[PDB]
Amino acid sequence: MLYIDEFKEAIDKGYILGDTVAIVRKNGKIFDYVLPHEKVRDDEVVTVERVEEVMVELDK
C-alpha cells in the first residue's frame, strides 16, 4: 500500500518529475505509483494523474 509520506518523498528526491505520474489503482483507490523504469504487472490498472491531485487524494 502507498502512503502519503512515500509519495512526497519520491517527489522531493526527483524520482517523480513533471506534473503527471503513473498511478496503479486497486479497485478504484490509489495502490502505488510507477516510475519510468519500473515493472507494472500484467493485471494492474495504470492511469496518468496529476501530482498535486494525487497528493490531495492521499490527504484524506
Binding site: 500500500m1 502507498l2 509520506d5 512515500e6 502505488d32 510507477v34 519500473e38 515493472k39 507494472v40 504487472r41
Partner: protein, 185 residues
C-alpha cells in the same frame, strides 16, 4: 582533514510504512525493537508480504546504515545481507553508501561524541525523536583511505565477533557448572 557532506556520498530514504495488519510472508522487517547495540536482531524480525515493484524500492543491501529517525533512542546499525529480502520500517532512515565512505565508518562517526552532537542538532523532537533528513545529510564526515576504513572495520568486526565468542562461552560454562551440580543431587 577534508570532509564530505553525508548527502553527497549516500542515497538516503525513509523506510516503508507497514500497518500492523500484515500477512506474515517472505520479506523481513527491521523495526526500532530489532536495533540492538551489537547489531540488528535478525532472528526476531517481523515477516510480511510486499509486491515486487514496491519491495525493490525499499530492499536493503549489504552495508546500509539504518538510523533510528523516530523513538527515544538514536540508534545506528549497519545491515548485513541475509538469506531473505529485508526492508526497514518507516521509523528508520537508511543511508546507502555511494563512494568514499564505508557504512561502518559512517556508523563509527555517528557513534562518536561529535556524531551524537550532530545527530541531536538535527533532531526536531523534544521528548521523542523527529530527525530532519536535510540536516542529517549536511553532516560532515572526515574522509580517509578506503583500505584504512576497511582495516579499522575488519578489526572492529573481529572484536564484535570475539565479544560474542566470550559471552557465549562464559554463559556456556556457567550453564555447565549449574548442571554439574543439579546432576550431583
Amino acid at each position: 582533514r577534508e570532509k564530505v557532506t553525508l548527502g553527497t556520498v549516500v542515497d538516503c530514504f525513509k523506510g516503508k510504512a507497514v500497518s500492523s495488519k500484515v500477512v506474515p510472508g517472505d520479506v523481513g522487517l527491521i523495526n526500532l525493537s530489532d536495533m540492538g547495540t551489537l547489531g540488528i536482531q535478525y532472528h526476531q524480525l517481523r515477516t510480511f508480504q510486499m509486491d515486487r515493484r514496491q519491495l525493490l524500492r525499499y530492499l536493503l543491501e549489504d552495508g546500509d546504515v539504518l538510523i533510528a529517525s523516530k523513538g527515544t533512542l538514536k540508534k545506528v546499525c549497519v545491515f548485513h545481507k541475509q538469506n531473505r529480502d529485508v526492508v526497514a520500517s518507516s521509523n528508520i532512515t537508511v543511508l546507502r553508501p555511494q563512494k568514499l565512505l564505508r557504512g561502518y565508518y559512517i556508523k563509527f562517526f555517528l557513534d562518536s561524541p561529535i556524531g551524537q552532537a550532530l545527530l541531536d542538532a538535527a533532531d526536531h523532537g523534544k521528548d521523542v525523536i523527529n530527525l530532519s533528513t536535510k540536516e542529517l545529510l549536511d553532516i560532515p564526515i572526515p574522509v580517509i583511505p578506503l583500505v584504512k576504513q576497511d582495516y579499522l572495520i575488519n578489526h572492529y568486526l573481529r572484536g564484535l565477533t570475539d565479544y560474542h565468542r566470550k559471552l557465549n562461552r562464559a554463559e556456556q560454562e556457567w550453564e555447565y557448572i549449574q548442571n554439574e551440580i543439579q546432576k550431583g543431587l
